[PDB]
Amino acid sequence: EVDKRREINNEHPLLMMPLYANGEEFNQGKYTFWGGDTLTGKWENIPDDLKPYTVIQLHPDDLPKRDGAARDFYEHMLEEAAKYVNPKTGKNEPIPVILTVYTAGNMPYYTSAHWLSTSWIDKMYQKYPNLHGIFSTESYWIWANDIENKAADYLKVSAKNGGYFIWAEQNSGSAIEKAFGKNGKIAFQKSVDKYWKNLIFMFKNTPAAEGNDSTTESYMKGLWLSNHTYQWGGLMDTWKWYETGKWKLFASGNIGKSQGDRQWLTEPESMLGEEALGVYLNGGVVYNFEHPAYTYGVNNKESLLFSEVIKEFFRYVIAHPAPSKEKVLEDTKVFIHGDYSNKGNGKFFVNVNTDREQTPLYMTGRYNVIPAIPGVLKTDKLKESVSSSRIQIKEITSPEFSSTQARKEYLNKLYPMNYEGDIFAQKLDNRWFVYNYKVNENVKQTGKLKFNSLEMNVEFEPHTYGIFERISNGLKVNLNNFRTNKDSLWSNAQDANQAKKLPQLTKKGAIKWIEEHYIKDTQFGEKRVTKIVLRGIDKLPTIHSLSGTNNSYDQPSLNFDQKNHMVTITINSNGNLEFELHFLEH
Ligand SMILES: C[C@@H]1O[C@@H](O[C@@H]2[C@@H](O)[C@@H](O)[C@@H](CO)O[C@H]2O)[C@@H](O)[C@H](O)[C@@H]1O
């Protein structure tokens, strides 16, 4: 094993920071990125506390589809990264980079990445110590005849150099199963046997109409737990709103895949945090997002989605490392072996822990994410673990998984009910994680959570998550319900028919909209109410260390009922929020 170029694990998580090449400007002799970020400027902007956990991911986007274009662009940017000087200290501090080397099956009619040989990648790794890895993303819809063979070579060249091969894919058309050899293409299977410690496997939740979110995430987790990948994570994509045909928030009717650039702007900001919790709570540690202009920003500035949701979430997962492999193994009661593609794909989990076929959220944390690996793989390394002795490893073809009802009846024997209410909640140590699981329905949810004898009842609007930690002197609360008003994008359309017929915003138009109406002159959402009721409290709690998104919250209201030893906390806000309540139990 050659020494790893960086650590990627629960204590050293990874936020990929995408920069997409502007191929139009490349044709004009310029080296630029869509949205106006620069490599140096973006890196400089990254808060210093996050720099150790953040890597610039170059993507070749619409560079010309000809030999040399991607190499030229990439070499230019690798040089810029390598030569970077920290202005505050005058020292050369090479910027860490991941290159996107494979996408859309590397077809020459789809991507300039086609013309990036493994020889060239090896050369770049050897020339640039700051090249930490290479990335393959989104080939499920164009599963090239040699994709597994190519993937083996990317993993091997990364292992040769101590870098990581990172692959983001969704289980559409059995993609994840095929990657590991389902249909007899076993080169990557063999590569992973040798080099899994240099592999990161991520979901890519883009193709949302196909509903493969839960099954792909199950596989990512299972592959990690069974030593087929070093770590896992996910790429969470606001284009899901386009893929599923949604339009104005909460509006009825479906417009199909007709208004892409309006659609990728509309997903509520805080919903990205809801998605990211599924990674974190299940031991994943690598995070990436699209569309980058909305999820990260433009012109070397942070979007509000980034500053108020993603940045704060990522800081949280650094301060509170995700559960380790050992911990997740100890907690796992059921591990599935077999192909979801033969058991309804995403339908497998509908009415088990997801509320519908097309969602990136869960409706209960009772089972967490049930880990699985494809049928082609073996569970030998899983069983060799000192931490796997109490796991029931079950074939997906088992009677226990034959129907929705059978799944719950089986899982309920091993995963006890641990809260009440129709809401998502999951407990880790002294922390309850809660969110409203509605996607595009304006419906409040309620739940009853306990910390031993202390009862906490919550009421949440959609697009709201919270983290409630019992601390020695009371409760720490982190709340995020940040959701700006996107109705302006949908003006002039009273119904779905009209919305479908709107003029296209276009890619350039959406970037401009972000600049003119999101980075500045933002149409913030209305403050909305969250309720928290604590029962079993001695005296009126005190509030401490209150902070959050500027101008986004009223002072929380505390109403203590001495006779009933309870307090009702009413919050009116739209943003991230943090505070501690200090109290004793009765
Ligand atoms: C092949 C992929 O292209 C880009 O993503 C596409 C988006 O640009 C958009 O068209 C959505 C629509 O749902 O589909 C995408 O496939 C890249 O961002 C991605 O990394 C792939 O290269």
Beta carbon of 242 within 6 Å of any ligand 1 atom: yes
CA atoms within 13 A on the CB side of 348: 27
- What residue's CA is closest to ligand 1, atom 15? 206
Ligand 1 atom with the smallest distance to the CA of 110 is 1
CA of 290 to the centre of ligand 1 (A): 9
Nearest to 295 by CA among 311, 274, 278: 311
CA of 241 to the centre of ligand 1 (A): 13
Compute CA 84 distance to the chain's CA centroid, rounded to the nearest angstrom: 29
Residue-level length of the chain: 586
Tell me how crowded residue 390 is: count the other CB atoms within 10 A of its CB: 11
CA of 104 to the centre of ligand 1 (A): 9
Q: Contact, 367 vs 402, CB < 8 A?
A: no
DSSP element (H, E) containing 477: strand 474-480
The C-alpha atoms of residue 578 and residue 580 are separated, in whole angstroms, by 7
The C-alpha atoms of residue 434 and residue 532 are separated, in whole angstroms, by 12
The C-alpha atoms of residue 162 and residue 286 are separated, in whole angstroms, by 18
The C-alpha atoms of residue 365 and residue 363 are separated, in whole angstroms, by 7
Beta carbon of 205 within 6 Å of any ligand 1 atom: no
Q: Contact, 59 vs 33, CB < 8 A?
A: no
At residue 459, φ and ψ (nearest 5 deg) are -130, 120
Ligand 1 atom with the smallest distance to the CA of 243 is 13
Beta carbon of 460 within 6 Å of any ligand 1 atom: no
Q: Could you tell me the domains of the chain?
A: 1-323+484-523 (3.20.20.80), 324-417 (3.30.2330.20), 418-483+524-586 (2.60.220.10)
| Best residue for ligand 1 mutational test, from 138, 147, 235 (most atoms within 8 Å of Cβ) | 138
The C-alpha atoms of residue 134 and residue 157 are separated, in whole angstroms, by 10
Q: Going by DSSP bridges, is the β-strand pair 54-59/97-103 parallel, antiparallel, or unpaired?
A: parallel
The C-alpha atoms of residue 236 and residue 9 are separated, in whole angstroms, by 19
| The residue to which tokens 């506390």 are assigned | 49
* DSSP notation for 25-82: HHTTT---BTTS--HHHHHHHS-TTTGGGEEEEEE-TT--SSTTHHHHHHHHHHHHHH
* DSSP notation for 229-240: SSEEEEEEETTH
The C-alpha atoms of residue 22 and residue 33 are separated, in whole angstroms, by 5
**Crossing angle of helices 147-161 and 118-127, rounded to 10°:** 20
For 331, 416, 447, 450, 467, the CA distances from 426, given in Å and listed in that order, are: 13, 12, 11, 11, 10
For 51, 334, 388, 523, 575, the CA distances from 304, given in Å and listed in that order, are: 19, 39, 42, 11, 10
CA atoms within 13 A on the CB side of 577: 29
Q: Going by DSSP bridges, is the β-strand pair 199-204/297-298 parallel, antiparallel, or unpaired?
A: unpaired
Give exposure, 366-377, as e/b (b: 16+ Cβ within 10 Å). Answer: bbbbbbbbbbbb
The C-alpha atoms of residue 93 and residue 281 are separated, in whole angstroms, by 33
CA dihedral 382, 384, 389, 392 (to 10 degrees): 40
User: What resolution does the deposited structure have, in angstroms?
Assistant: 1.5
The C-alpha atoms of residue 301 and residue 365 are separated, in whole angstroms, by 35
Partners of residue 336 on adjacent β-strands: 372, 394
Beta carbon of 275 within 6 Å of any ligand 1 atom: no
Beta carbon of 481 within 6 Å of any ligand 1 atom: no
Token pair in block for residue 213: 């979110």
- What residue's CA is closest to ligand 1, atom 12? 239
* DSSP notation for 537-585: BSS--EEEEEEESTT-BPPPEEEEETTTTEEEEEEEESSEEEEEEE--B
